[PDB]
Amino acid sequence: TRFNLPPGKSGLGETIGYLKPYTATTLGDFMQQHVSKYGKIYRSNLFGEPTIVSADAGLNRFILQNEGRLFECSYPRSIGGILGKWSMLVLVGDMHRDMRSISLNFLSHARLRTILLKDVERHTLFVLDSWQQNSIFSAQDEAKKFTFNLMAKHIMSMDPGEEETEQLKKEYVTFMKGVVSAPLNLPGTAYHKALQSRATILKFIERKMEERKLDIKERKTDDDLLGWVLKHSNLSTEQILDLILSLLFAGHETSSVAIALAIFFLQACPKAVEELREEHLEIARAKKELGESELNWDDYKKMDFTQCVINETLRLGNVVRFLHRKALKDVRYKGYDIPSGWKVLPVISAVHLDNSRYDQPNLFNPWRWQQQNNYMPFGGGPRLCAGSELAKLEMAVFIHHLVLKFNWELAEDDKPFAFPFVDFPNGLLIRVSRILHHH
Ligand code: HEM
Numbered sequence: 001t002r003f004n005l006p007p008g009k010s011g012l013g014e015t016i017g018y019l020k021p022y023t024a025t026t027l028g029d030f031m032q033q034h035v036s037k038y039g040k041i042y043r044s045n046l047f048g049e050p051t052i053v054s055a056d057a058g059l060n061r062f063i064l065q066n067e068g069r070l071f072e073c074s075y076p077r078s079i080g081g082i083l084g085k086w087s088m089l090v091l092v093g094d095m096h097r098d099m100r101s102i103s104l105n106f107l108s109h110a111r112l113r114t115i116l117l118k119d120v121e122r123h124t125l126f127v128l129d130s131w132q133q134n135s136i137f138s139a140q141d142e143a144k145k146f147t148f149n150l151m152a153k154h155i156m157s158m159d160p161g162e163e164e165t166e167q168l169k170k171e172y173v174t175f176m177k178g179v180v181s182a183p184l185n186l187p188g189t190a191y192h193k194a195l196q197s198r199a200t201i202l203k204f205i206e207r208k209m210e211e212r213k214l215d216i217k218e219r220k221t222d223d224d225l226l227g228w229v230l231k232h233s234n235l236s237t238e239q240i241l242d243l244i245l246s247l248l249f250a251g252h253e254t255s256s257v258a259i260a261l262a263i264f265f266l267q268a269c270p271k272a273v274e275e276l277r278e279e280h281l282e283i284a285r286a287k288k289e290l291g292e293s294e295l296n297w298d299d300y301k302k303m304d305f306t307q308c309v310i311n312e313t314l315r316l317g318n319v320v321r322f323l324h325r326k327a328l329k330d331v332r333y334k335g336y337d338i339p340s341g342w343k344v345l346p347v348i349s350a351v352h353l354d355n356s357r358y359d360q361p362n363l364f365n366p367w368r369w370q371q372q373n374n375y376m377p378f379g380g381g382p383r384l385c386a387g388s389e390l391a392k393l394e395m396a397v398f399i400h401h402l403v404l405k406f407n408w409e410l411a412e413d414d415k416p417f418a419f420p421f422v423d424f425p426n427g428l429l430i431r432v433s434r435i436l437h438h439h
């Protein structure tokens, strides 16, 4: 083959072993064994392609920052099949840049600080005020309701707990299993089921688009993303559809996982919950003195220990395990040959769990962040998560009201696994009890 390729078993495929589920607060047996035997940069045959796998933090940074120059986003076909050819995980170059710009304006700082913050709180309370005490229920399911409803409101003005919002959410439950499965469009497979849901979702959104276009004729309307792209962009119908469909997927499957992880880590770390309660009680009490009832951006900026808990939740729990890229030309990195056209997987989660970068890396220790290259849960470079500031705001507002209203406990054993999407197999069943006297 090539003398300076990274070592490996095989440049004979290893996809099944690579994808075998593992405990989400580790890298799993397959990755650990390959790194122990071959080193942090190794070769394999994965997803049908010769592949370089990187658990090396410096190479991962280099890959992400040289997007569009030496490396390019290159996901398996199931992603583009389900999220669409105009989604941001498929688009490259100028079209990707323009889609990203639209996304950034809509999670733009100004809109985020004002209108979005206020909806985030209202949706947090819609969920928390429905919870019954001393009754087993799935925290993972409730977190996805919160974040999906919030996105449906922001993108298409859909109201939470209305029938059409609940039915739309049910369609999204098929997506993640389809995205990670073989792209066999055959009756009964997970990919076929997600494509059927895609068809249903697309029909729903395009009907709402046609209604909104009539509304804009009769001058009734651009306060949500759908209205915005209709009036202020020249995207085509299909481009709008994939933008909306894929942002609702992000609303189902990203920050909801993070919130479920936080609820799990925190019930095993009561000292962190006590310190969160002090922080949030002080914010609430100050607001009550002023007569304020809604959070504002200045309140959010006070949530310093909450940010420590958010950073630690993302570091330990690793919502995203690795990203898909390909080499755009031959790259020779510290002696290793990365040939043109090969797949390249930056395992962004690896640096988070490296005991030479983080003391006791498998421990939930939010104080490692307090008053404090090694942290990339949102990716990096020109594809750095465009929702990251909304994701942190959702987590923080949800924790704010969670710790003020309730104590909680696990109803049974559970722990998160990576499939590679992160999921609590037993649903993170909890019970809550209402706090009647704060300290
Ligand atoms: C803790 C929660 C989240 C995590 C860990 C996360 C992680 C990521 C990662 C790793 C990527 C890069 C994918 C790649 O480059 O291959 C990404 C991209 C993206 N994410 Fe997030 N995300 C989260 C929440 C959100 C939310 C709430 C939204 C709201 C829509 C969002 C929207 C986006 C968008 C639009 C991109 C594409 C950026 C681009 O291609 O330029 N994400 N996310």
Ligand SMILES: CC(C)CCC[C@@H](C)[C@H]1CC[C@H]2[C@@H]3CC=C4C[C@@H](O)CC[C@]4(C)[C@H]3CC[C@]12C
Residues within 6 Å of the ligand: 076, 083, 087, 088, 089, 179, 180, 246, 247, 249, 250, 253, 254, 320, 321, 322, 323, 324, 420, 421
């Ligand atoms: C497209 C825009 C709207 C943003 C999407 C953000 C979220 C949904 C993206 C960012 C990182 C993505 C993950 C990155 C890598 C992989 C591994 C691949 O083998 C299966 C899909 C999976 C697990 C992706 C699932 C979707 C994901 C979590």
Ligand SMILES: [Cl-]
Residues within 6 Å of the ligand: 001, 002, 003, 004
């Ligand atoms: Cl050779």
